[PDB]
Amino acid sequence: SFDRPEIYSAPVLQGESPNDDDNTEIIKSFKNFILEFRLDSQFIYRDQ
Amino acid sequence: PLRIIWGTNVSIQECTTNFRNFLMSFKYKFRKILDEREEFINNTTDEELYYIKQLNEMRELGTSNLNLDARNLLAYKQTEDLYHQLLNYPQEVISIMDQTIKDCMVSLIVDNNLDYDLDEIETKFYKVRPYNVGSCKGMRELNPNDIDKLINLKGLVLRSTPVIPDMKVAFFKCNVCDHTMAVEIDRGVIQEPARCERIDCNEPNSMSLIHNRCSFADKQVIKLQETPDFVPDGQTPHSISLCVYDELVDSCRAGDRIEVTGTFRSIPIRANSRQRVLKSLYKTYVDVVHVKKVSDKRLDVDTSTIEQELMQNKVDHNEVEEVRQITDQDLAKIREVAAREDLYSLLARSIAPSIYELEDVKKGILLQLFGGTNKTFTKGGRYRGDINILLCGDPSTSKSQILQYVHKITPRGVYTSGKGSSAVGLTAYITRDVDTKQLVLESGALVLSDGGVCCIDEFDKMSDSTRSVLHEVMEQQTISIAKAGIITTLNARSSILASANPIGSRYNPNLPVTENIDLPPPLLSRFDLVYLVLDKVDEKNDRELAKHLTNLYLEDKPDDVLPVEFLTMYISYAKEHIHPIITEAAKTELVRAYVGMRKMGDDSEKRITATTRQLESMIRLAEAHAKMKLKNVVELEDVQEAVRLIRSAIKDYATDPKTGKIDMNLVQTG
Amino acid sequence: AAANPLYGRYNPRLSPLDNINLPAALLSRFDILFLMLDIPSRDDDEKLAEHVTYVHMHNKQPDLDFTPVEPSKMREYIAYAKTKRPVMSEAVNDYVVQAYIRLRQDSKREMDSKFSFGQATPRTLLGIIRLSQALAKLRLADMVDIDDVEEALRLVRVSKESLYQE
Amino acid sequence: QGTQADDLVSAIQQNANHFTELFCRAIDNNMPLPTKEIDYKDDVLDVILNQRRLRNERMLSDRTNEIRSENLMDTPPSSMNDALREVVEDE
Numbered sequence: 001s002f003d004r005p006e007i008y009s010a011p012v013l014q015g016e017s018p019n020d021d022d023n024t025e026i027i028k029s030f031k032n033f034i035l036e037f038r039l040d041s042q043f044i045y046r047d048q
Numbered sequence: 049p050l051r052i053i054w055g056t057n058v059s060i061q062e063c064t065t066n067f068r069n070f071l072m073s074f075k076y077k078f079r080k081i082l083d084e085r086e087e088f089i090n091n092t093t094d095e096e097l098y099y100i101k102q103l104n105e106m107r108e109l110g111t112s113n114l115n116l117d118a119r120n121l122l123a124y125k126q127t128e129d130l131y132h133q134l135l136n137y138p139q140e141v142i143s144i145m146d147q148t149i150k151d152c153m154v155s156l157i158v159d160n161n162l163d164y165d166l167d168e169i170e171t172k173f174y175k176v177r178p179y180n181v182g183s184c185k186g187m188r189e190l191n192p193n194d195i196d197k198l199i200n201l202k203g204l205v206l207r208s209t210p211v212i213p214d215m216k217v218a219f220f221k222c223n224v225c226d227h228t229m230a231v232e233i234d235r236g237v238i239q240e241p242a243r244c245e246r247i248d249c250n251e252p253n254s255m256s257l258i259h260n261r262c263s264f265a266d267k268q269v270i271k272l273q274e275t276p277d278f279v280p281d282g283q284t285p286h287s288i289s290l291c292v293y294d295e296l297v298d299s300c301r302a303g304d305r306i307e308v309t310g311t312f313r314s315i316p317i318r319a320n321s322r323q324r325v326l327k328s329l330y331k332t333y334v335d336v337v338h339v340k341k342v343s344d345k346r347l348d349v350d351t352s353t354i355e356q357e358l359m360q361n362k363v364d365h366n367e368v369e370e371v372r373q374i375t376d377q378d379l380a381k382i383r384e385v386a387a388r389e390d391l392y393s394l395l396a397r398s399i400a401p402s403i404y405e406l407e408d409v410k411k412g413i414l415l416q417l418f419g420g421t422n423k424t425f426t427k428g429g430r431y432r433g434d435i436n437i438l439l440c441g442d443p444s445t446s447k448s449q450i451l452q453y454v455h456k457i458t459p460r461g462v463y464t465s466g467k468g469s470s471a472v473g474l475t476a477y478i479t480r481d482v483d484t485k486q487l488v489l490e491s492g493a494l495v496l497s498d499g500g501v502c503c504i505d506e507f508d509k510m511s512d513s514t515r516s517v518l519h520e521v522m523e524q525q526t527i528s529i530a531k532a533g534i535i536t537t538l539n540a541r542s543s544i545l546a547s548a549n550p551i552g553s554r555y556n557p558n559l560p561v562t563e564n565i566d567l568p569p570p571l572l573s574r575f576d577l578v579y580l581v582l583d584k585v586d587e588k589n590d591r592e593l594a595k596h597l598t599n600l601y602l603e604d605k606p607d608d609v610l611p612v613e614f615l616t617m618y619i620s621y622a623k624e625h626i627h628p629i630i631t632e633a634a635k636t637e638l639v640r641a642y643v644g645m646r647k648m649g650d651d652s653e654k655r656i657t658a659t660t661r662q663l664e665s666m667i668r669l670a671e672a673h674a675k676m677k678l679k680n681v682v683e684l685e686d687v688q689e690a691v692r693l694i695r696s697a698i699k700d701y702a703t704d705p706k707t708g709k710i711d712m713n714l715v716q717t718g
Numbered sequence: 719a720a721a722n723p724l725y726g727r728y729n730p731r732l733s734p735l736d737n738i739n740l741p742a743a744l745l746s747r748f749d750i751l752f753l754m755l756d757i758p759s760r761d762d763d764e765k766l767a768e769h770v771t772y773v774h775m776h777n778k779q780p781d782l783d784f785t786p787v788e789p790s791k792m793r794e795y796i797a798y799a800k801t802k803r804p805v806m807s808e809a810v811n812d813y814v815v816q817a818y819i820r821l822r823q824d825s826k827r828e829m830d831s832k833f834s835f836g837q838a839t840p841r842t843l844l845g846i847i848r849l850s851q852a853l854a855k856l857r858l859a860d861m862v863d864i865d866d867v868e869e870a871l872r873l874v875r876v877s878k879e880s881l882y883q884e
Numbered sequence: 885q886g887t888q889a890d891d892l893v894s895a896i897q898q899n900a901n902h903f904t905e906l907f908c909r910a911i912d913n914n915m916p917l918p919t920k921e922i923d924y925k926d927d928v929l930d931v932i933l934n935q936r937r938l939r940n941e942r943m944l945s946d947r948t949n950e951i952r953s954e955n956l957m958d959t960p961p962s963s964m965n966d967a968l969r970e971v972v973e974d975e
């Protein structure tokens with residue numbers, strides 16, 4: 001009457017080099033655009 | 049800072065530097081002072097750079113394998129951690145060691161400006177074989193935390209699979225454009241290309257693997273019967289599977305005792321062939337790194353039985369040694385010891401120091417160990433110099449201890465008991481393999497003991513049907529099997545050493561010798577030597593035996609006798625290099641002795657009459673005696689000693705020719 | 719091992735080799751063989767009868783002048799005895815050698831007679847040494863004494879000869 | 885002492901399979917630091933577990949460091965650290 005086996009992961013090695021067409025790198029670039037964009041002197045999207 | 053392989057404590061650069069310093073700076077005097085052996089240190093062997101000279105001779109002979117004693121790593125100060133890293137993490141450390149060996153190979157020829165070409169060295173792949181990695185712990189005492197660790201196992205080889213092709217590069221060809229690629233395997237997985245790689249052709253599912261174009265490696269599975277030093281309570285012997293790869297395939301034959309060092313591996317097994325579901329309980333096995341077939345305590349294998357195997361070993365370049373190497377100083381010692389006038393008594397006395405007296409029995413055992421010369425006819429006939437000995441005796445005569453000693457001293461013999469063995473279990477049988485669920489042929493005790501001595505205790509108690517197997521073994525040194533699975537002729541070149549009791553369990557002087565032995569004449573004629581070992585009670589003999597038995601218990605660990613290592617190597621050298629021949633003076637003496645004992649047999653069963661097999665036994669024993677003294681010819685005194693040993697073994701001087709009875713008092717001297 | 723004679727009941731008419739259906743080689747393996755004779759007597763049977771009736775009535779042992787050692791206590795004492803490793807000296811070795819010589823000569827004398835219990839062998843000597851070492855282990859001593867050897871010898875003698883003589 | 889305690893013995897007796905994991909959680913919550921340092925004679929499992937613990941610490945530190953490098957509010961230090969560890973251990 002046992003429960004589920006569970007699957008989980010943890011980052012260990014660097015892996016292959018990142019690719020621009022990879023979804024994770026596109027998400028990271030979008031995140032950097034949200035955080036670091038400056039219109040005149042303000043973080044407009046972060047504050048928004 | 050320091051770069052460490054994940055899951056290890058191993059730094060590649062640190063390990064390379066430590067191992068290179070070990071290779072450049074190790075001396076065997078470090079091993080001597082590690083083992084607390086200071087008085088045995090000599091300059092000419094220890095002071096020279098050990099691994100440098102092995103690398104030099106390895107370059108000179110063109111070999112690629114280096115044998116590394118891991119105890120030497122513990123001897124050196126800087127590589128004490130490297131020893132534990134090699135034991136704990138052999139997969140990375142062994143590869144690091146191979147790279148360091150290749151670096152030292154190129155550095156030795158660049159530094160000394162030798163004429164050896166660098167391109168030929170660079171193309172070669174060098175690999176190191178560690179051994180003596182620790183104590184031979186029990187295989188069943190290992191835990192799952194010992195997986196992927198280096199271990200030592202002593203064992204007996206029962207059988208091996210045929211050579212298995214293990215795919216390393218896969219060859220794909222396009223069906224439409226005949227475009228071919230080769231993909232190298234990665235951790236047991238080959239990725240099929242879903243589409244053709246060429247820019248012109250892009251058909252999906254068009255690459256087909258060609259099984260005969262692609263390359264394979266040799267893989268062999270060997271069933272090993274472990275013989276650990278320590279056995280816990282109520283433990284039965286087990287068989288493990290060991291996997292050998294590449295050059296080590298077919299190095300081990302069935303029935304030989306080996307030291308295996310290798311990594312302790314576990315894999316999941318598929319529950320079904322069609323399903324990819326694996327079983328949670330893992331199957332354990334050993335991936336073999338190094339095999340040792342040489343022990344200093346016991347003799348080496350008879351090379352006349354493995355001449356073609358030695359040729360195939362040279363072809364395969366496995367660089368595994370079946371025989372121990374004889375150096376010049378110890379060969380000089382062998383030649384000096386052979387010049388002793390008391391050589392026969394010294395060699396027989398050094399057989400079983402724990403066993404007191406039994407001088408003629410020990411002499412016969414020594415001659416059985418030496419053996420007669422082996423003659424192979426160019427036409428196709430074959431004569432083997434195998435001596436069979438029967439020891440019929442009273443209880444408490446140490447003949448079981450003699451059989452135990454011979455079983456320990458022989459390279460590949462088998463020890464069996466009366467009524468503990470069957471006719472099928474002695475020759476060959478068919479078993480169902482656990483891994484493959486297939487019927488496989490497996491050798492019996494006599495075939496496993498080929499090239500050695502088969503010891504049979506309680507030979508009197510064996511069944512007659514089980515006895516009758518031994519006829520062909522004793523006379524032709526082979527078994528001709530015609531069964532459902534196998535119909536063939538199998539070599540069983542095993543000298544038979546049997547121990548037996550009389551009918552009444554004690555020798556009866558009222559009955560003749562033949563009745564006391566109680567063997568059929570066809571079986572008893574095939575024995576070269578028959579020893580009647582008798583218990584005569586005397587003051588001095590009983591006093592001496594009692595003192596000898598009580599000196600053992602004076603201390604916890606107990607004339608001049610040769611050490612067992614020197615004894616084994618001396619007998620090994622004599623068997624390998626001495627093949628004595630009969631001369632005319634030996635021929636006339638052999639003929640006169642055979643005619644004389646046939647004339648003695650004319651008198652009126654009660655007595656064992658002379659038969660032609662006794663003439664063959666005289667020839668074999670004379671050849672063995674000549675081989676003992678390193679002489680290449682059998683002259684008259686060897687034949688006289690063989691005749692004397694035959695007479696004294698049955699105590700023919702003590703018995704009366706007419707009655708056949710033996711009287712204890714009137715002649716016998718204990 | 720536990721056994722009965724060949725006829726099922728021991729008879730003094732036959733030799734003790736004759737009514738014991740045991741080969742000499744298997745006889746020599748046993749370090750101690752106890753002949754256990756059921757000889758009726760008026761005094762010895764009464765003590766057995768009162769012992770057995772007391773056991774059947776109070777479900778325990780008769781003699782209240784000693785307390786039996788518990789099996790667990792006996793087990794740990796025997797374990798501590800088995801940890802010991804006694805060795806023999808020169809004097810006990812000489813005494814053992816002389817005893818073995820006397821045993822061999824005595825057996826040779828008894829061989830023709832009906833009093834024979836077999837022939838003394840080196841296994842008899844090794845059994846004497848083994849019993850002496852066991853008796854030294856019980857005293858938790860690292861050496862074997864004269865008295866332990868004499869106790870082993872008297873155990874061997876009252877095993878077979880003493881009860882058959884009576 | 886007079887304080888009220890649950891019957892832990894009976895609860896373990898009825899449902900021991902759960903209490904194995906509960907005791908393991910309690911033990912892992914209060915585990916003393918090793919006085920000894922790891923050398924080359926330790927087990928492979930021990931150095932694997934040590935590397936896993938060091939990896940967990942390094943990921944936690946890297947996550948909180950880059951989140952602090954964001955400064956996504958430019959704004960109560962202790963409450964900020966509590967919310968910081970809360971978001972880092974969740975990501």
Ligand SMILES: Nc1ncnc2c1ncn2[C@@H]1O[C@H](COP(=O)(O)OP(=O)(O)OP(O)(O)=S)[C@@H](O)[C@H]1O
Nearest residue numbers: 402403404442443444445446447448449743840841
């Ligand atoms: N001649 C001897 N030299 C040294 N030890 C002996 C000698 N004879 C007997 N012993 C000792 O006595 C023990 C008796 O065992 P064994 O003599 O080997 O038995 P056995 O000779 O095979 O006779 P069996 O078993 O009845 S056929 C040996 O283990 C030795 O310790």
Ligand SMILES: [Mg+2]
Nearest residue numbers: 447448505547
């Ligand atoms: Mg025996």
Ligand SMILES: [Zn+2]
Nearest residue numbers: 222225244249
């Ligand atoms: Zn194509």
